[PDB]
């Protein structure tokens, strides 16, 4: 229970720095592919 998650938090950066990112497409800050130009 609590002991387990506490121990796995004690080594949290030792696990992996792989940061899954959340991609949105409807929010205004999203960029189309044809958005980028001169490329």
Partner 1 sequence: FLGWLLAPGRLEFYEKAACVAIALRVLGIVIAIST
Partner 2 sequence: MGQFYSREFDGDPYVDLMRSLPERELVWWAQKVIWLAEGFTFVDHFARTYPRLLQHKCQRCKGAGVMTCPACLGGGCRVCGTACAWDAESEWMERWGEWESRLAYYDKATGPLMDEWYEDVLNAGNLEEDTPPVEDDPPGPEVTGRWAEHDRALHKDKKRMAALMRRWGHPYDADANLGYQIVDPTASMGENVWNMAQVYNSLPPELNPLRTQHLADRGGGNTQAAVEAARSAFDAQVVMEAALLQNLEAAAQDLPKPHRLPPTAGTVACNECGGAAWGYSFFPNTAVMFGLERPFWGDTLARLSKYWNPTQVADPARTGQLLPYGEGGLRRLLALEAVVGKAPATTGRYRRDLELLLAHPELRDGALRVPGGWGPEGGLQTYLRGQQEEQARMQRRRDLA
Partner 3 sequence: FSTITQPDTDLIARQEKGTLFWDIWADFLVTAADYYNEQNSLIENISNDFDNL
Q: Which two tokens stand for residue 16?
A: 């992996």
Cβ-based neighbours of 5, under 8 Å, separated by 6 or more: none
Binding of partner 3 at residue 5 (CB under 8 A)?
A: yes
CB of 11 to partner 1, least distance (A): 18
Cβ-based neighbours of 8, under 8 Å, separated by 6 or more: 15
Report the site for partner 1 in 1-39 (rule: CB under 8 A): 1-3
Chosen residue from 10, 25, 27, 37 binding partner 3 by CB under 8 A: 10
> Could you list the residues that contact partner 1 (CB under 8 A)?
1-3
């Amino acid at each position: 229970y609590r002991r387990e998650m506490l121990h796995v938090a004690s080594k949290l950066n030792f696990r992996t720095p792989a940061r899954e990112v959340r991609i949105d497409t409807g929010s205004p800050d999203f960029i189309k592919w044809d958005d980028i130009n001169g490329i």
